[PDB]
Structure 1
Amino acid sequence: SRRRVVITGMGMLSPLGLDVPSSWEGILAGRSGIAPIEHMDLSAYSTRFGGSVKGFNVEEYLSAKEARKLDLFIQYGLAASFQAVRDSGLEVTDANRERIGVSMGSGIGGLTNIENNCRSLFEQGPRRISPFFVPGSIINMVSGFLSIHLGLQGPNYALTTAQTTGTHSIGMAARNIAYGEADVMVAGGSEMAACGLGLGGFGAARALSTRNDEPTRASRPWDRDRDGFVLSDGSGALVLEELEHARARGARIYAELVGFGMSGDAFHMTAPPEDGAGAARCMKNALRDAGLDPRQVDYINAHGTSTPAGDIAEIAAVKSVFGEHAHALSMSSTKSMTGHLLGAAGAVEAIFSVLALRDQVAPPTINLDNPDEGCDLDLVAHEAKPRKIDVALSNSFGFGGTNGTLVFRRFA
């Protein structure tokens, strides 16, 4: 029967730092990780900025010989995974290696690599395609390479559910442990879609902020002057662990994962429904899964992408799920500071949600100068808000009408 699941380790690369504590300090100080992109010429592009990981050194983790074969999304995935496993204190042994798996996902995976090899194919010929093209680019190889490096023989898989990937990865990993398929899972996501096809593709859909002259003010969830999301890069990994297993080894427990919801919108390939009906179904699934009264929810880490339709749909969904309690909880979008890490969004945001529980503080929504029509909740505008938080919720929504909710609470 269903076992309980706690968080014993976390790891991160974000536009705000090369680990969790450095990223969290930026979150709490309301710092932007958004800047003009330096790693390519974007003068032909309508969007020329985003949340880059600054000063990442893959040789802190892996030999340059192996790193050369791997897309940045995999490098980012392994970095955050190695941080999480070390943060857990867990020792992999012959006695437990079959009971430790990994579920690290990505929305797009190795787009930079596929682009670079596409360039080789068209400019030279197929003889110049890397022998490492396939294993160095496909989405399941964060899970693959992590298992090879650490000797993890448990369930080994990857989700790809677009901007919901991190939330789904973590939730389904928790189910694996809940149901006895594993005692430990490394789960989250990673993304590096800042290449020509990535910025060009989101640019073609007119989905991205074009505020090139003030990139730090571009991401403004629920602000009336918002004009699309800011594309960001990085990784979040969490060590999920069966409660008694964690207790038995004296693990430090950050928080308990008590609820997981999924639901499809079945509305539109890319647009959310204005009323937030799919997000509402998903949160209600997650709160019932947690055995909670919705009034127990203190803090929501919103999806909060800074799109016109997305932001308002989320207000509608929260008001519909929480009624008058929608005015008592605190909801913020850390995307105001990090931008939108796509498949890694749910992973870093799950970590920020856990850290809101540890430090009893709601992260700010920076740049919320003029809340839009109907955006009249506590959105923690401008400055972090210290407050009681026993129960934190993290929402993700994606293309395909795919929805995910994680519910975390303090563990005593």
Structure 2
Amino acid sequence: MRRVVVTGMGIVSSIGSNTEEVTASLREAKSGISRAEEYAELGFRCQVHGAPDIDIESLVDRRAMRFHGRGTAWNHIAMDQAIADAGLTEEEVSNERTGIIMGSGGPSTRTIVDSADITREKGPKRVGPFAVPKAMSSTASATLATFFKIKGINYSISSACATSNHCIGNAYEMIQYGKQDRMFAGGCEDLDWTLSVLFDAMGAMSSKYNDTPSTASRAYDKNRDGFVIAGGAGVLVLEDLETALARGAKIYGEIVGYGATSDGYDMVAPSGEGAIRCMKMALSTVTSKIDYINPHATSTPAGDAPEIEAIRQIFGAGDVCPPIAATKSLTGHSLGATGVQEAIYSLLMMQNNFICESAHIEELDPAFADMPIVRKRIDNVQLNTVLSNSFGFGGTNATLVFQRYQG
């Protein structure tokens, strides 16, 4: 099986509109979370969100936008960034050996709702002719494959909050097994009340911190009370090692493990044992110690702990365990986009020799007092191997491991 490397990255995030802005936010623990006044207007309990700040119309032209939801438009931007970063020619983007696996947690729920509303108010014709590619679950792959003239693999993986981790893993497999030489992988999510309300109604999102929105997302804090929802996108360019070397690619890291498992337990809560099996599977092909763990940790009361226990079972406790820092405390939870964004955060930390603070821990939950959760940024650290988990409703688990390429 061939080796697979990351040669370009692109990102639209609550903590920055490119990798430079994101790096600065991670380094300085600058929260991306703000008050969502619209949610207050609609009567939500949770009134906080992690919103990108980026001018779409300046970066994607009107004709491309014809078939984009906001999430996939952010994905388009991230794709442009990743192609530029990688330095690809048009020929390298558009060829039979180059594909795309790009997903989202949901489609454009706003398109679905607006279409239903206008059907009832003004008639079906007034839905307009461009709604299907926004409303279908493949929207992220469909739009980008068409606009970037992708000729190889073209589909989306959907796995709720694991989505873009699986997208990367399956793209990794496609290259390992020789079917493709280059893949664009990642995903996106719109940020919209029509999705967010589904989580508010289940009591899944933070509401105790509405008066201090910036600190509402606080994985591992004793008084965490739900995740904070976010939108955005991320893209990695993946290539087989020989293809990358031959064209003088920048190598951000090598993908060296991937796990994917299923809990078979509860629809909306994790079992823990599925995560253990997932991490073991990702680690089974890894031959160095892990220097940093980017957990799934979303700041829910019932979510953060089973993952820590799974980590304990694999890695042990205290100094022997790798440092753990939950980036969702800064970024919120971008659902479909979170796996790829966390891969990018981890690869940027590797590049810049620091591990970010696990932010907004005002009082550590004592159940985690034995674990090396990062309370202050760690500088001048040589990260060679990093692990990132993502999990999703329906008991779906994905883990990726990336390594500094040294030959």
One fold, TM greater than 0.5? yes
SS in 1 for 2:367: coil
In 1, the alpha carbon distance for the partners of 2:210 and 2:395 equals: 29
Give the alignment of 1:13-24 within 5 angstroms. Answer: 13-24=12-23
Q: Once the 2 structures are TM-superposed, how far is the Cα of residue 40 of structure 1 from its aligned partner?
A: 7.1
Please say if residues 92 and 152 of structure 1, whose CA atoms lie closer than 8 Å, have aligned partners that are also in contact. no
- Unpaired runs of 5+ residues, structure 2, are none
1:47-69 C-alpha deviation (Å, 9 max, x unpaired): 22200111x22233322243254
Q: Indicate how the Cα distance of structure 1 residues 107 and 96 shifts in structure 2: closer, same or farther if over 3 A, else same.
A: closer
1:10, distance to aligned residue in structure 2 (A): 0.2
- Partner SS, residue 357 of structure 1: helix
Match of 1:199 in 2: 196
The alignment status of 1:367 with 2:367, answered yes or no, reads no
1:319 aligns with 2:319: no
The letter of the residue matching 1:351 is I
Q: Identical aligned pairs, as a percentage?
A: 39
Structure 1 residue 399 and structure 2 residue 397: aligned?
A: no
- Residues 105-184 of structure 1: pairs in structure 2 closer than 5 A: 105-184=103-182
Judged with a 3 Å threshold, the aligned counterparts in structure 2 of structure 1 residues 386 and 230 are, in CA distance, closer, same or farther, namely farther
Matched, 1:337 2:337: no
Residue 408 in structure 1 maps to residue 402 in structure 2: yes
Aligned mates of 1:368, 1:176 — CA distance in 2: 40
Residues 18 and 358 (structure 1 numbering): CA distance in 2 closer, same or farther, change over 3 Å? same
Residue 264 of structure 2 aligns to a residue in which SS? coil
Please, which of 199, 215, 218 is the counterpart of residue 217 of structure 1? 215
Q: Please give the secondary structure, in 2, of the residue aligned with 1:308.
A: coil
Q: Which moved more, 1:326-335 or 1:203-212?
A: 326-335
Deviation digits for residues 179-219 of structure 1 (CA, Å, limit 9, x no counterpart):
01110000001001422x32221011110001211111110
Structure 1: stretches of 5+ with no match in the other structure: none
Could you say what secondary structure the match of 2:133 adopts? coil
Query: Which residue matches 1:272?
Result: 270
Partner of residue 387, structure 1:
381
Report deviation, 1:409. 0.7
Q: Is contact 2:318–2:372 with CA below 8 Å preserved after alignment?
A: no
Q: Deviations over 1:89-109 (max 9, x none)?
A: 121328971111011100012
C-alpha distance in structure 2 between counterparts of 1:229 and 1:382, whole Å: 22
Q: Alignment length, in residue pairs?
A: 404
1:63 aligned residue: 61
1:44 is matched with which residue? 43
What one-letter code is carried by the residue in structure 1 that aligns with 2:322?
A: L
Deviations 1:335-373 (A, max 9, x none): 000000101000100111111221221121111121113
Q: TM-score, normalised by structure 1?
A: 0.94
Farther off after superposition, 106-115 or 241-250: 106-115
Q: 1:95 to 1:347 in 2, by over 3 A?
A: closer
Which amino acid in the other structure matches residue 195 of structure 2?
G
Correspondence for 2:303: 310
Contact persistence 1:106–1:191 (CA under 8 A): yes
**What TM-score, normalized by structure 2, do the two folds share?**
0.95
